[PDB]
């Protein structure tokens, strides 16, 4: 069956956006860093390692606003033991109606792919925001590219995208704009 | 990795 249950009713009329975690909303690593926004303990073979996470600039405004405009869904190739705690700490407003991790992606030709057909939404009303064009090779027409992010504290790409999404949120068919 |  599909990955998502039916949209709950205030969301039925909304475009579903699939949003990626790593290098899109945050950048994490095992290398300590003093200014991590989050530190997450992750157990790998019985040893607890520390993951240090930085928030992309304007991520908070981004999610708050996207959370009103869309049925927002987290889709990541990372494992839940990492992504779930990050999503918990990052998503103060409940933008994310659902979360999907590595086991929900399709492993194909090397890559973990976000197969949008598997969501169970109408694809004319689906978008994927993802920094890696490999993630949506099955549906590149549903995509809003976004540059990879690592630590540039001058980044404004999440602020700067909101106007595009505001107008996207209104249309009947996303292909009408991304062709 | 557990990350992406
Ligand atoms: Mg990513």
CB-closest option in A24, A26, A78 to B2: A78
Alpha-carbon distances, residue A82 vs A19, A28, A94 (angstroms) = 16, 10, 18
- Direct distance between the N- and C-terminal alpha carbons of chain A, in angstroms, rounded to an integer: 28
Q: By C-alpha distance, which of A99, A100, A12, A82 is closest to A44?
A: A82
What is the side-by-side strand order in the sheet with A47-55?
A: A26-29, A47-55, A38-44
Size of interface A-B (CB pairs under 8 A): 27
Task: Compute, in angstroms, the gap from residue A43 CA to the centroid of ligand 1.
Answer: 21
The CATH number assigned to the domain holding A131 equals 3.40.50.1000
Structure tokens, A90 = 């990052």
Q: Where are the beta strands (DSSP E) in chain A?
A: 16-19, 26-29, 38-44, 47-55, 71-75, 96-100, 106-108, 111-113, 126-130, 143-145
**Domain span including residue A3:** 1-179
How do strand A111-113 and strand A96-100 relate by DSSP bridges?
A: unpaired
Q: How was this structure determined?
A: X-ray
Number of domains observed in the structure of chain A: 1
Q: Please judge whether B4 and A24 are an interchain contact, meaning their C-beta atoms are less than 8 angstroms apart.
A: yes
């Amino acid at each position: 069956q599909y990955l998502l249950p039916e949209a709950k009713a205030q969301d039925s009329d909304k475009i579903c956006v699939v949003i990626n975690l790593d290098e899109t909303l945050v950048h994490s690593s095992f290398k300590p860093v003093n200014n991590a926004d989050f530190i997450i303990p992750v157990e790998i073979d019985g040893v607890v390692h520390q993951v240090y996470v930085l928030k992309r600039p304007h991520v908070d405004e981004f999610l708050q606003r996207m959370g009103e405009l869309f049925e927002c869904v987290l889709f990541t190739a990372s494992l839940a033991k990492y992504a779930d705690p990050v999503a918990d700490l990052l998503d103060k407003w409940g933008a994310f109606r659902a979360r999907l991790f590595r086991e929900s992606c399709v492993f194909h030709r090397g890559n973990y792919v976000k197969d949008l057909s598997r969501l169970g939404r109408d694809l004319r009303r689906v978008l994927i925001l993802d920094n890696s064009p490999a993630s949506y090779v099955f549906h590149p027409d549903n995509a809003v590219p976004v540059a990879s992010w690592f630590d540039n504290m001058s980044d404004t790409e999440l602020h700067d995208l909101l106007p595009f999404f505001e107008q996207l949120s209104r249309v009947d068919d996303v292909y009408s704009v991304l062709r | 990795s557990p990350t992406x």
